[PDB]
Design a protein around this nucleic acid. Sequence first.
DNA 1: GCATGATTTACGAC
DNA 2: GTCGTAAATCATGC
Lengths: 74, 64
Amino acid sequence: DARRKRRNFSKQASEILNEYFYSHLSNPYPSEEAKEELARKCGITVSQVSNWFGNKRIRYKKNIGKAQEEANLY
Amino acid sequence: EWTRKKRKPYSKFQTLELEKEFLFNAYVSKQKRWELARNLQLTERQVKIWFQNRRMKNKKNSQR
DNA sequence: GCATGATTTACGAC
DNA sequence: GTCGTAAATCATGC
């Protein structure tokens, strides 16, 4: 159970995962090659990118009336 | 833009007994799948999908 | 006290 | 069959 050894990602890596997410509002699904490269910059395993985008997709959807419109991107 | 059941967390007894069977064979027969379903209060599909997921868990844990 | 990452049911692709 | 998921839930960080 790696929930016991769980730690928050680096704030820099979060700025990358959120960068891809909001910029691609139409299709929030990275390819196998994209996720392979997205994991490289953040110092995390690919499965953790999959876990993040998995968690971020649903938790985004829950917010329909909050300042979730952080699509400052550009 | 882009935007069939509620997930039921199984019991400890349900999950643990499923784990014992997995140690024998990761792939179990359709008759025993019916047996597992009878003792652990699950449907035939749910016992099948559980072994599907538990199998991928091994590939997920044992990986590089 | 929630935010957050990892895990557990459940289903459709193929 | 596997493989990518949605989703409820978990465990922890702060």
